[PDB]
Amino acid sequence: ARMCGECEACRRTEDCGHCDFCRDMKKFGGPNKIRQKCRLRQCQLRARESYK
DNA sequence: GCCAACGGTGGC
DNA sequence: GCCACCGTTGGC
Ligand SMILES: [Zn+2]
Ligand SMILES: [Zn+2]
């Protein structure tokens, strides 16, 4: 839907730890106010372009 | 019951 | 129209 499942980003298992989206995650100390996938995991086909 | 992460939105 | 945010919920 937002995932082609076939691109580099869909195949990643590891959050980068460093992008705006990662720094938001509780697992990285963030306040969980934004709540999107790591930038490197945003499907290059299907994702909002501004998430890429 | 928690959580990843989506879709909708209010304010700009 | 954008985007920061947050309500929602499938999957666990
Ligand atoms: Zn990241
Ligand atoms: Zn993809």
One-letter amino acid of A45: L
CA A43, CA A40: separation in Å to the nearest integer?
A: 8
User: How many Å from the CA of A11 to C1' of C9?
Assistant: 24
The domain limits of chain A are 1-52
As given in the structure block, the two tokens for residue A52 are 């890429």
Binding residues of A for Zn(2+), by number, are 4, 7, 10, 16, 19, 22, 38, 43
Whether any strand B atom is under 7 angstroms from the Cβ of A47: the reply reads yes
CA A39, CA A5: separation in Å to the nearest integer?
A: 16
DSSP A1-52: ----SSSHHHH--S--S-SHHHHHSGGGT---SS----GGGS-TTTS-TTT-
Q: How far away, in angstroms, is A9 Cα from ligand 1 center?
A: 11
Phi, psi dihedrals of residue A28, rounded to the nearest 5°: -120, 10
CA A12, A41, A39 angle in degrees (round to 5)?
A: 140
CA A3, CA A42: separation in Å to the nearest integer?
A: 8
Q: How many residues comprise chain A? A: 52
